[PDB]
Write an enzyme that holds these catalytic residues in place. Structure first.
Site, mmCIF file in Angstrom:
data_model
loop_
_atom_site.group_PDB
_atom_site.id
_atom_site.type_symbol
_atom_site.label_atom_id
_atom_site.label_comp_id
_atom_site.label_asym_id
_atom_site.label_seq_id
_atom_site.Cartn_x
_atom_site.Cartn_y
_atom_site.Cartn_z
ATOM 1 N N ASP B 105 0.597 -1.209 -0.094
ATOM 2 C CA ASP B 105 0.208 0.095 0.081
ATOM 3 C C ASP B 105 0.738 1.321 0.085
ATOM 4 O O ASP B 105 0.319 2.384 -0.421
ATOM 5 C CB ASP B 105 -1.144 0.095 1.034
ATOM 6 C CG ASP B 105 -2.075 -0.916 1.003
ATOM 7 O OD1 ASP B 105 -2.395 -1.246 -0.058
ATOM 8 O OD2 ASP B 105 -2.641 -1.493 1.853
ATOM 9 N N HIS B 139 -4.744 3.272 4.422
ATOM 10 C CA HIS B 139 -4.633 1.836 4.291
ATOM 11 C C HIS B 139 -3.064 1.681 4.949
ATOM 12 O O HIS B 139 -3.150 0.654 6.068
ATOM 13 C CB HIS B 139 -4.685 0.953 3.216
ATOM 14 C CG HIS B 139 -6.059 1.322 2.539
ATOM 15 N ND1 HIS B 139 -6.142 0.830 1.066
ATOM 16 C CD2 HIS B 139 -7.304 1.896 2.722
ATOM 17 C CE1 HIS B 139 -7.754 1.248 0.737
ATOM 18 N NE2 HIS B 139 -8.171 1.858 1.592
ATOM 19 N N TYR B 143 -2.262 0.113 9.227
ATOM 20 C CA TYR B 143 -1.503 -1.004 9.806
ATOM 21 C C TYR B 143 -0.635 -0.809 10.813
ATOM 22 O O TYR B 143 -0.591 -1.463 12.050
ATOM 23 C CB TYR B 143 -0.785 -1.773 9.062
ATOM 24 C CG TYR B 143 -1.411 -2.377 7.608
ATOM 25 C CD1 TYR B 143 -2.623 -3.163 7.709
ATOM 26 C CD2 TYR B 143 -1.257 -1.537 6.531
ATOM 27 C CE1 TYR B 143 -3.325 -3.419 6.473
ATOM 28 C CE2 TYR B 143 -2.058 -1.812 5.325
ATOM 29 C CZ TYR B 143 -3.016 -2.884 5.174
ATOM 30 O OH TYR B 143 -3.891 -3.136 4.084
ATOM 31 N N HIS B 233 -11.266 0.130 -6.089
ATOM 32 C CA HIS B 233 -10.111 0.511 -6.684
ATOM 33 C C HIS B 233 -9.618 -0.277 -7.847
ATOM 34 O O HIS B 233 -9.268 0.183 -9.035
ATOM 35 C CB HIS B 233 -8.981 0.582 -5.500
ATOM 36 C CG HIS B 233 -9.111 1.576 -4.621
ATOM 37 N ND1 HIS B 233 -8.288 2.097 -3.430
ATOM 38 C CD2 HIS B 233 -9.989 2.669 -4.369
ATOM 39 C CE1 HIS B 233 -8.705 2.694 -2.543
ATOM 40 N NE2 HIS B 233 -9.859 3.408 -3.286
#
Lengths: 326, 325
Positions: B105, B139, B143, B233
């Site tokens: 990402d 995104h 994490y 996406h």
């Protein structure tokens, strides 16, 4: 290029092996961000780590910009319809044209100007910040279209976009900035971005601030202030990062960049006089506009760490306009 | 040749000081700012959201904006007891898996999605990629939000060192990054669709597995917010790929399909190497790759290509499918 079109471009490079190690300090120090890979094939690529902040300013700016998220759909722009109709035809035409030229600047920053700052960013968290800034610049650009959809006829919108494409001085302004984004010197990119966010739109922002100071277009003024709340941080942050890069440069490069900054400012200032001077020549506030331009030019310079160029005499913005800024 | 204090635009012929209402030819020849570098002297056009070229762009822009979220609104700290009830292997594997997802990402947010702008078919599509790249930074950030809530500094440090030191992970990410440099814009789109619709799903299997077992329930909610974004996406990347593809010659179409299957097959083998090793101490090994191949078919479908893997090869367990919703 001559590589067979079915082949992967990575087939040109020596593949990584099959080892798995806990990278030691030297391996970590040589790892790079994804955006740097293009010219460092074979280097190891490192994920962003928000629990390893390199510059505390990055975390503060990220958090502030994200907390300030807004959408034009939440501003009741349709409550300005009576005020808009009480303007003159010249005031309406001037507003749609000015806002279309602002759209052009924000469109450029959103889709290349801010994005080209990522590859040579000083920190990985700064790279993430530029993705937020570019998105919010797309929001700024979209928001002028939201004004137009609420207030303007299809014919009025169409002619304003044709006016913008056909305005040679507008084209010189935008392409002057776009060319600097092609420099390989990342600090030239940063200077241009700082000028865009801290200077180039402000002769345009003067107009809705003027209307608000006269009690007109009040809801539109709220949206403009949401835009200004972002851009003040955008320009501060661009200039801050310019200075972080500048202080690592040789004395030779520091002198080049100082002279380059003054050349760019002078050129963009003269183009503003030609561009906005022609747009505003039929208005009493013409001279105040350029007090306001020079006033923000000083902030742009200050954001970059350079001294002010224009005197207090040259930057005396009327109190009504300054009050409209809040 | 330019002195370093001079403006790069001084190498170009200046625009004049004329001001005209552009006629149709002048508007037709105008370009987006991201195309200017290939067309100096051309006139640049601001985005016009009251002149939509492809209605799909407005629908996707509105959906993605309405789905805006931040990890700070997920109560991840309510997962702390569940996290502590896992085994040592489960905790270590989670931080490593998520650090690997962060890497993909990070790559998409900071170059992968952005390199799609310059050859985009519409100006509104260009604006959408700025939203998508920002959400991909979200995104990646999320994490780290998990790690901040759950993990020690030592755990975080080792996970990032593991990722840099993992040769196969490096091969996976650099394989994608090289395609983003391709002179063919549709190769960039194929790669982007693979990333959003395939490359993270062997990793997403793990939190879905935990949720199917009643563990890490709030983390699973955040993962589903991520998936809600990535489904659009990857659909959108593949849609735009297909709009570009129908204007290409027959030989280019054939080569692009072969390239797609070469990329997919290379990335699949790398996934087996990478995630096969990661999940070696877990008994759900076979189910992971049923889930990988299942999402590979969707990736191909998003691109308009037939499914590659059979019904037998894509038989995801119903506990994992239920945890998706």
């Amino acid at each position: 290029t001559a590589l067979d079109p079915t082949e992967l471009r990575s087939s040109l490079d020596k593949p990584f092996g099959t080892n798995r190690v806990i990278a030691d300090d030297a391996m970590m120090a040589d790892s790079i961000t994804p955006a740097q890979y293009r010219y460092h094939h074979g280097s190891r690529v490192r994920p962003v780590n928000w629990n390893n902040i390199v510059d505390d300013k990055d975390l503060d700016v990220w958090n502030r910009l994200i907390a300030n998220f807004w959408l034009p759909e939440k501003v009741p722009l349709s409550n300005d319809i009576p005020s808009w109709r009480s303007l003159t035809d010249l005031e309406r035409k001037t507003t749609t044209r000015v806002f279309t030229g602002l759209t052009l600047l924000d469109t450029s920053q959103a889709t290349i100007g801010e994005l080209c700052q990522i590859e040579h960013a000083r920190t990985e968290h700064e790279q993430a910040i530029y993705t937020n800034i570019a998105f919010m610049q797309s929001i700024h650009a979209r928001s002028y279209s939201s004004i137009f959809s609420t207030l303007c006829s299809s014919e009025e919108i169409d002619e304003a976009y044709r006016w913008a494409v056909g305005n040679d001085v507008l084209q010189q302004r935008v392409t002057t900035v776009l060319c600097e984004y092609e420099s390989e010197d990342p600090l030239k990119r940063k200077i241009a971005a700082t000028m865009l966010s801290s200077l180039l739109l402000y002769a345009g922002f003067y107009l809705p601030l003027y209307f608000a100071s006269r009690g007109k277009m009040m809801n539109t003024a709220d949206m403009i202030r949401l835009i200004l709340r972002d851009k003040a941080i955008h320009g501060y942050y661009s200039g801050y990062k310019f200075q972080r890069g500048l202080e690592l440069r040789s004395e030779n490069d520091k002198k080049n960049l100082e002279k380059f900054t003054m050349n760019l400012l002078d050129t963009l200032y003269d183009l503003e006089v030609e561009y906005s001077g022609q747009i505003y020549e039929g208005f009493d506030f013409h001279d105040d506009v350029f007090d306001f331009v020079r006033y923000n030019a000083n902030k742009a310079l200050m954001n970059l760490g350079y001294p002010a160029k224009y005197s207090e005499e040259e930057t005396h913005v009327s109190p009504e306009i300054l009050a409209a800024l809040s």
